Write a protein that binds this DNA or RNA. Structure first.
Ligand SMILES: C[C@H](CCC(=O)NCCC[N+](C)(C)C[C@H](O)CS(=O)(=O)O)[C@H]1CC[C@H]2[C@@H]3[C@H](O)C[C@@H]4C[C@H](O)CC[C@]4(C)[C@H]3C[C@H](O)[C@]12C
Ligand SMILES: [Mg+2]
Ligand SMILES: [Zn+2]
Ligand SMILES: [Zn+2]
Ligand SMILES: [Zn+2]
Lengths: 49, 389, 102, 92, 45, 49, 243, 50, 69, 49, 334
RNA sequence: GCCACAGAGCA
């Protein structure tokens, strides 16, 4: 939903389209939800009890 | 990464930094406190002794010299004191007393026939210790120590000779007596360094970079008021690294300078973006910090709005003057008859196993033979054809 | 007395008939290259006028002028320099007239 | 007590003869410097500092095709960059 | 020739051949060499 | 931490594979003139070309 | 490499070459050896040269090609709404050749209202400057972001956002130049085609021309990243919240 | 002789004002916490143990 | 350690505004944003020169070596 | 003619150190291999290495 | 057209399009009479340290050349060498020399001759090519001081070394040439150094003239810049409360409301710094269009105090003309 | 000068 909403002449979108630097995931993290954090293939382990 | 690089920033050390004689001290001529502060900065009194300067940054692709983290510096900004630093070094000598009731001496100044000191003693003074304030070039002596030979005794000359790529000035000379009643002499030299190509700069959000080019003020872009950036940063460092805090720092610094108050960038809080956008709108600037710049080369308007504002930059201790090295032929080790190690002993670079294997993969036999036998340890030897030894 | 080292004609880039040529100018930069480009491009006989600084370390400027068959590139360069002189004279006269007026 | 460096200790490890002096070794005529970009250079070209180029030397043997050039380099001297540092005669 | 500064009491003093490395006005044992009187040239760059 | 394992693995692989070469009869052989492959890859084609 | 002498106390290499070295300009140091024998010198320049090592031996793909800030400038030149008059065209052509090469100006893509050249014609001139140049390359390739056309019966060049690049002769007829066409890791790139068909020298010349053009162009045609490029719109914050 | 740590209760810089620090040639903003042994200032680092 | 003579970006002489800035904040009790405007500093590059300046010269002068402290 | 010329120049040149090339072409990708946890075709309990 | 259009995400039509080959009409050929008729100069302000003037119907390349020549090619006098006698300050010698080199000097550059670099130092400096400035400041404790004072200007005598302490020392014929125009710093309140009792500064500065490209201390302009004239076109009438909102998108003197029709109109587009706030709101879309006139430059030249800004602009025009004449007179070597 | 120790730089 985020990527299709960004207008043209958007610098991260242009740089992801070129492949010069960055990707769609980085733009989605900066503008929209960062997402689940994966540690050792799982979610966050129980540091406490 | 910036927790790592904050401890390498060149800046003020203490209020008595000019009464101190340390083995290596980098000082900044014109330190400035940041616009976008933090509560932790005020609580630890970092704003009293800052390390870094506020630079007008235009985030744009200026030339090919800003590719891969490299930075474009303004020559006129450097000429006015941006990034200027000084390096102070200490040389210590002990005039130890031997068991033969003989001690080292310092006095001596070889004068020529005309009545002037020789070139090696041009800045050495009458007492044998170099004069404060005079320039010392490579090969000159600032401590003229002599050691007795048997340790009327005869003294051999073992002077302290300055050997460096650039001249230095004698800043301080200190004589004292240690706890064991031995004369101790400390000479503190200083040299002034300006930013050049290869000098490392950090931006307090990681984003380390060396200078790629130093261009004139006329070649820089400019806005309506005539403001010229000091550092131009490539836009490509932001998407793959996701440093939105740098963008918010630029906007907060712009709004703070225009409003006249230092801003706060405290974690889980700080200055909100809407208030700074409102300040920028009320001051006649864009809400997003994007200005309209005219190119200094062609004069025409740039076809994209340029993200323009103050960013706090830190000058790191890693400067090219201490990294450049070249050997050709020089000292060799006594055991292996191979070049020594390190630029402090005029050593050579190591062509290790991996580089040897890469040259093998290329198939260049003669190059490998030249590098590993001709240029390092070639030796003509007698071999017996019968016993092999 | 004349400065033989100032402006050179690069033979390896010029044409046989002189229609296309490239000139190397020492101790010049964009402040004259852009003005020369603008003025020479206003010549109806010039189809390619463009300058370049090959390296910022070298104080040098290469300007390429390719024309049609009516005039050579040297004549185009001389006409462009003369027209730049005329433009500067006009600007100077107007500026001094307005300063003396007020 | 620090153990002595025997003959086996001089032959094994990364600092031994084989991995420190035989497979890889220190070489002459080399330099190390920080890199910075330069797009105006050709891709088969690297820019060397003038200070480094005055230390790193190439031994050119005088032929009938390069006598005048090496004469000019010898006249220029070790300080001017298009120059020379050492001369080795044929019979010396 | 006055050539040395006591680091504590800040008094000009000179040392002979047989004089110990200490101040005369106080017992402080650190001496700093004074600035030379020779002309020193700098470029303003 | 992955650099140590990568470097050791590369050192082992190169110490095991350095002696091989393509001879003039199009057979890959070791330094002791013993055949590993009769034709490189079954077809004798360079991956570079 | 071939040595050039410069006065600024640092090693300097072209940014198309920092990718095989895995090197970036943030404090990296490299080493410079000088072979002392004619045999070693010839072996180094003929087997270890940059021109003769444009392809990695891992897969045969190019490794010395366009990098960041060169792909973006090339994309902005080759973008479909990039129209240049003769003055801008000629300036760009002198920018990529240091005022040395002879350029044969092709007829413009638009003639009646004004005379305007598309940046694809600029890149066609970059590949082949004049009629004396022997570089004639033909290729069909897909970009990194390819949106298929409306109907499956239509060919790939009729796609949206110029997904498909077609080069016939030396003219670029469709598509934009990105990492798939000018960068590394793909065997359908322009520089790979030039290297395979006409040798390494022409590919090196094209890479140098592209590097100079994209190093001098993006300064005069600005490209910036700001917080407006990162802030979400009003309707996104509701959709994200509900999802 | 115990080498004392700076700005501890056995030090001369304990609860001293800025004028006394200027008299003793010590910076008032120095954090302290180190030992001056043979002129070199050394810090005992904190250790994790079980 | 001392106020720069010239602004780094443009080149305006801001070294002569430091004492007047201190007087405006101390005597007239003006805010920092209005004192800068009263001194003719309109461009933000000049304003950050004496708005971010840390006057370390006074702290360094406490340790003068030629006069008891 | 083009196809035959490309075929004849794709053959492995004699004298090539193809073992060293293969050793590097295997060792080098180990550097860029970041951590990922994989599963064997829709089974989230196997965790093949 | 000649209007650089300003959009919400990009800037359009930024390149000059006045040359034959742009269209089949083959117009806009270089005619000096047409340029003389079309070019205009309008002075809006002319003070001693700042000039503001509009150049109308001139190309961007020439205006940029004027700006670059003012910044880096117009010579001015600044301190180049500093000779030190007993610098006891906590400020280092290099820093003090740099600061003295950075002060502006009120010397007409036409009265000095360029210094020949290849000449030896014994005869490099003459009375026609060097101005000698002497500084001599000693700091002593004030005996008649207030008891509880903390101000450094009352406890000490010369605790502040200013720029006005740089006295001018005439040498030779400079005693007569510089009689009516003595050398003083343009900003006498520059704080060069701070002192405490026992500290002394004594130095002689040799000042020559150079260009700003060599060093930024030789640039005679605080800033020399231009901005294109803004242009706001209200395509459809804006009435009522929205008009008040339309007034808040611009600086206060830009757009005003008529008393009769209660509609907004542009009053002074010169004050309009382009913040493009009006393009944020969707209500003003297809009602306002923003641009800049491409051939209407507003030069704002601020001098450093050495000489008048109008003289700087005139010298820049003369320098460009002399560059063109020198290239015209040179022979072309193969 | 030898020897360890400690920190730092680049992925
Ligand atoms: C520097 C130069 C001489 C160079 C040798 C002299 C000679 C001609 C002089 C100008 C003219 O007088 C016109 C005009 C008069 C105003 O009153 C002040 C400004 C103007 C622009 C002058 C400035 C300056 O004084 C000039 C250029
Ligand atoms: Mg790196
Ligand atoms: Zn035998
Ligand atoms: Zn004393
Ligand atoms: Zn400023």
């Amino acid at each position: 939903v985020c990527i299709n909403e960004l207008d043209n002449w958007n610098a991260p979108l242009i740089m992801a389209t070129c492949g010069s630097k960055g990707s769609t995931l980085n733009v989605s993290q900066m503008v929209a939800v960062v997402g689940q954090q994966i540690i050792s293939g799982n979610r966050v382990p129980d540091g406490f009890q | 990464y910036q927790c790592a690089m904050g401890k390498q920033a060149i800046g003020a050390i203490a209020y008595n930094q000019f009464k101190r004689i340390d083995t290596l001290l980098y000082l900044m001529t014109y330190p400035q406190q940041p616009m976008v502060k933090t509560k932790t900065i005020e609580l630890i009194d970092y704003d009293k002794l800052p390390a870094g300067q506020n630079a007008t940054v235009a985030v744009m692709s200026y030339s090919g010299y800003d590719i891969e983290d490299a930075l474009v510096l303004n020559k006129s900004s450097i000429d006015r004191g941006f990034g200027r630093c000084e390096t102070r070094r200490k040389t210590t000598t002990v005039l130890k007393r031997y068991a033969n009731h003989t001690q080292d001496i310092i006095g001596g100044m070889r004068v020529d026939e005309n009545g002037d000191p020789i070139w090696q003693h041009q800045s050495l003074g009458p007492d044998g210790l170099g004069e404060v304030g005079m320039k010392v070039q490579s090969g000159q002596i600032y401590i003229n120590k002599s050691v007795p030979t048997n340790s009327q005794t005869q003294y051999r000359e073992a002077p302290v000779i300055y050997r460096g790529p650039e001249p230095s000035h004698i800043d301080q000379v200190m004589m004292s007596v240690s706890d064991n009643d031995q004369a101790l002499i400390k000479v503190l030299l200083r040299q002034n360094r300006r930013p050049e190509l290869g000098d490392k700069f950090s931006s307090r959000h990681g984003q380390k970079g060396v200078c790629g080019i130093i261009v004139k003020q006329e070649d820089m872009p400019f806005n309506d008021q005539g403001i010229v950036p000091d550092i131009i940063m490539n836009p490509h460092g932001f998407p793959s690294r996701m440093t939105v805090g740098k963008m918010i720092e630029l906007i907060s610094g712009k709004a703070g300078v225009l409003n006249g108050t230092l801003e706060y960038g405290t974690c889980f809080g700080g200055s909100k973006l809407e208030d700074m956008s409102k300040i920028l709108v009320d001051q006649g600037f864009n809400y997003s910090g994007k200005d309209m710049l005219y190119s200094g080369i062609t004069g025409e308007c740039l076809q994209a709005y340029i993200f323009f504002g103050p960013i706090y930059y830190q000058k790191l201790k890693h400067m090219v003057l201490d990294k450049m090295h070249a050997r050709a032929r020089g000292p060799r080790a006594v055991l292996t008859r191979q070049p020594t190690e390190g630029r402090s002993r005029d050593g050579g670079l190591r062509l290790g196993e991996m580089e040897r294997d890469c040259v093998i993969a290329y198939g260049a036999s003669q190059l490998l033979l030249e590098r590993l036998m001709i240029s390092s340890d070639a030796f003509e030897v007698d071999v017996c054809d019968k016993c092999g030894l | 007395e004349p400065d033989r080292e100032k402006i050179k004609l690069l033979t390896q880039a010029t044409s046989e008939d002189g229609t296309s040529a490239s000139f190397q100018i020492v101790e010049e930069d964009h402040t004259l290259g852009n003005a020369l480009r603008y003025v020479i491009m206003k010549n109806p006989d010039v189809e390619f006028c463009g300058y370049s600084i090959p390296h910022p370390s070298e104080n040098l400027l290469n300007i390429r002028i390719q024309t049609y068959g009516e005039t050579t590139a040297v004549d185009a360069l001389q006409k462009g320099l003369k027209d730049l002189m005329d433009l500067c004279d006009v600007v100077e006269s107007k500026f001094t007239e307005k300063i003396k007026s007020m | 007590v620090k153990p002595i460096r025997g003959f086996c200790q001089r032959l094994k490890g990364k600092q031994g003869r084989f991995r420190g002096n035989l497979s890889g070794k220190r070489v002459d005529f080399s330099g190390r410097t920080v890199i910075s970009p330069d797009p105006n250079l050709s891709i088969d070209e690297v820019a060397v500092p003038d200070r480094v180029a005055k230390v790193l030397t190439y031994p050119e043997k005088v032929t009938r095709y390069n006598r005048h050039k090496l004469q000019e380099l010898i006249v220029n001297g070790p300080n001017v960059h298009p120059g020379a540092n050492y001369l080795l005669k044929r019979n010396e | 020739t006055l050539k040395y500064i006591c680091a504590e009491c800040s008094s000009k003093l000179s040392l002979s051949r047989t004089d110990a490395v200490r101040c005369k006005d106080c017992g402080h044992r650190i001496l700093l060499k004074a600035r030379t009187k020779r002309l020193v040239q700098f470029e303003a760059r | 931490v992955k650099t140590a394992e990568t470097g050791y693995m590369s050192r082992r692989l190169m110490k095991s594979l350095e002696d091989l070469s393509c001879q003039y009869d199009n057979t890959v052989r070791t330094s002791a003139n013993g055949i590993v492959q009769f034709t490189y890859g079954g077809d004798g084609l360079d991956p570079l070309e | 490499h071939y040595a050039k002498i410069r006065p600024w106390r640092t090693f300097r290499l072209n940014e198309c070459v920092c990718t095989p070295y895995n090197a970036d300009f943030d404090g990296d140091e490299m080493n410079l050896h000088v072979p002392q024998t004619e045999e070693a010198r010839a072996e180094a320049i003929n087997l270890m040269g940059v021109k003769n090592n444009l392809l990695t031996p891992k897969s045969g793909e190019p490794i010395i090609a366009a990098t960041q800030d060169f792909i973006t400038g090339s994309y902005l030149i080759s973008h479909k709404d990039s129209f240049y008059d003769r003055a801008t065209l000629t300036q760009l052509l002198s920018m990529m050749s240091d005022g040395i090469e002879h350029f044969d100006i092709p007829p413009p893509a638009i003639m009646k209202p004004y005379y305007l050249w598309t940046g694809k014609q600029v890149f066609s001139l970059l590949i082949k400057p004049n009629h004396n140049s022997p570089v004639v390359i033909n290729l069909d390739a897909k970009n990194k972001v390819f949106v298929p056309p409306k109907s499956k019966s239509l060919p790939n060049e009729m796609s949206q956002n110029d997904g498909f690049v077609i080069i016939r002769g030396s003219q670029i007829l469709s598509g934009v130049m990105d990492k798939s066409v000018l960068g590394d890791g793909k065997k359908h790139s322009v520089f790979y085609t030039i290297l395979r068909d006409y040798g390494p020298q022409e590919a090196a010349n094209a890479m140098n021309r592209m590097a100079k053009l994209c190093a001098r162009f993006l300064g005069n045609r600005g490209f910036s990243i700001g917080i407006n490029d990162v802030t979400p719109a009003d309707d996104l914050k509701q959709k994200k919240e509900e999802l | 002789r115990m080498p004392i740590m700076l700005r501890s209760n056995k030090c001369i810089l304990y609860d001293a004002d800025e004028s006394k620090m200027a008299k003793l040639n010590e910076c008032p903003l120095d954090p302290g916490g180190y030992f001056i042994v043979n002129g070199t200032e050394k810090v005992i680092l904190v250790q994790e143990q079980l | 350690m001392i106020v720069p003579v010239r602004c780094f970006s443009c080149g305006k002489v801001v070294g002569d505004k430091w004492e007047s800035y201190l007087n405006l904040l101390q005597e007239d009790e003006l805010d920092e944003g209005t004192a800068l405007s009263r001194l003719g500093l309109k461009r933000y590059c000049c304003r950050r020169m004496i708005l971010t300046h840390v006057d370390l010269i006074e702290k360094f002068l406490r340790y003068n070596p030629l006069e008891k402290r | 003619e083009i196809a035959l010329f490309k075929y004849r120049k794709a053959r492995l040149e004699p004298g090539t150190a193809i073992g060293a090339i293969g050793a590097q072409s295997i060792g080098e990708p180990g550097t860029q291999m970041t951590l990922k946890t994989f599963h064997f075709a829709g089974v989230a309990s196997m965790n093949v290495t | 057209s000649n209007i650089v259009g300003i959009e919400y995400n990009r800037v359009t039509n930024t390149t000059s399009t006045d040359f034959p080959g742009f269209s089949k009409d083959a117009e806009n050929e270089w005619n000096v009479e047409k340029f003389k008729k079309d070019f205009e100069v309008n002075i809006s302000s002319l003070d001693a340290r700042e000039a503001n003037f509009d150049l109308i119907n001139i190309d961007t390349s020439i205006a940029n050349a004027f700006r670059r020549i003012m910044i880096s090619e117009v010579p001015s006098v600044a301190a180049e060498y500093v000779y030190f006698f007993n610098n006891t300050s906590v400020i280092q010698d290099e820093v003090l020399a740099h600061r003295i080199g950075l002060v502006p000097l009120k010397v007409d550059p036409d009265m000095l001759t360029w210094v020949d670099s290849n000449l030896p130092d014994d005869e490099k400096f003459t009375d026609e090519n060097t101005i000698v400035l002497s500084l001599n400041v000693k700091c002593t404790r004030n005996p008649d001081a207030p008891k509880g004072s903390t101000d450094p200007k009352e406890l000490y005598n010369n605790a502040h070394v200013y720029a006005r302490d740089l006295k001018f020392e005439p040498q030779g014929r400079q005693s007569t040439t510089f009689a009516d125009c003595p050398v003083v710093p343009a900003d006498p309140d520059i704080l060069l150094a701070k002192l405490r009792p026992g500290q002394e500064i004594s130095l002689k500065a040799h000042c020559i003239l150079g260009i700003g490209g060599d060093h930024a201390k030789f640039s005679p302009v605080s800033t020399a810049s231009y901005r294109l004239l803004p242009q706001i076109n209200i395509l459809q009438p804006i009435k009522g409360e929205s008009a008040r909102r339309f007034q808040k998108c611009f600086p206060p003197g830009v757009i005003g409301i008529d008393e009769g029709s209660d509609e907004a109109y542009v009053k002074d587009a010169r004050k309009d710094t382009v913040s493009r706030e009006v393009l944020r709101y969707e209500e003003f879309a297809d009602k306002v269009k923003l641009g800049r006139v491409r051939n209407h430059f507003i030069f704002n030249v601020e001098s450093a105090g050495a000489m008048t800004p109008e003289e700087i602009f005139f010298k820049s025009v003369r320098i460009l003309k002399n560059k063109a004449e020198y290239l015209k007179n040179c022979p072309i070597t193969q």
